[PDB]
């Protein structure tokens, strides 16, 4: 399946991201590289005051449609 989420940076700039509940955190970073040109190794993703773990799925973190991830430049 698919859902739309958001990713927000310290600029305030908030981008849509098209994901799937089964996606791993690494896969989400890969999508961010495709959209924004930020390599995975240069990214952290934060939700609910946690840094999301690379091998966990979006479904594990209970990420819903229209949820906002916070992107951090590594």
Q: Which CATH class is domain 1-74?
A: alpha beta
Asked if 1 and 57 count as a contact pair (C-beta separation under 8 A), the reply is: no
| Annotated resolution, angstroms | 1.4
Question: Contact at 8 Å (CB) between 47 and 70?
Answer: yes
Question: How far from 5 is each of 21, 32, CA to CA, in Å?
Answer: 11, 12
Elucidated via: X-ray
Cα dihedral 17, 19, 45, 24 in deg (nearest 10): -160
């Amino acid at each position: 399946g698919s859902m739309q989420i958001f990713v927000k940076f310290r600029t305030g700039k908030t981008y849509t991201l098209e994901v799937e509940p089964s996606d791993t955190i690494e896969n989400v970073k890969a999508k961010i590289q495709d959209k924004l040109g930020i390599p995975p190794d240069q990214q952290w993703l934060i939700f609910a005051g946690k840094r999301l773990e690379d091998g966990r799925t979006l479904s594990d973190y209970n990420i819903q449609k229209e949820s906002t991830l916070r992107g951090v430049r590594r």
